[PDB]
Structure 1
Amino acid sequence: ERREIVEVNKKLKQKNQQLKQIMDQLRNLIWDINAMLAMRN
């Protein structure tokens, strides 16, 4: 019962960590594109 809840919480935390790792690169690419296309001309 409680062990299953703890394991689910650990899995959710790992998934959230991977999600944040992906979002870091996502926002990095967004900033890079939006800042490089702005210096055009």
Structure 2
Amino acid sequence: ASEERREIAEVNKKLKQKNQQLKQIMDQLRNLIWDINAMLAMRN
């Protein structure tokens, strides 16, 4: 149905928008795990 396809698009848009929230998390979580190791490995 045409209307059903519209709801899927709305779900995809919400899921796609939620994915954008998720990608920033990894970059932040990734960045932190990067930074901690670089700071520590150099420890004296």
TM-score by length of 2: 0.86
The structure 1 segments of at least 4 consecutive aligned residues displaced by more than 6 Å after TM superposition are none
Measured after TM superposition, the shift of residue 40 of structure 1 is: 0.6
Q: Return 5+ residue gaps in structure 2 as ranges.
A: none
Identity rate, percent = 98
Measured after TM superposition, the shift of residue 3 of structure 1 is: 1.0
Counterpart-to-counterpart distance in 2, 1:28 and 1:34: 10
Measured after TM superposition, the shift of residue 19 of structure 1 is: 0.3
Counterpart-to-counterpart distance in 1, 2:36 and 2:26: 15
Larger Rg: 2
Match of residue 35 from structure 2: 32
Q: Return 5+ residue gaps in structure 1 as ranges.
A: none
TM-score by length of 1: 0.92
Q: Count residues with an aligned counterpart.
A: 41
Measured after TM superposition, the shift of residue 35 of structure 1 is: 0.4
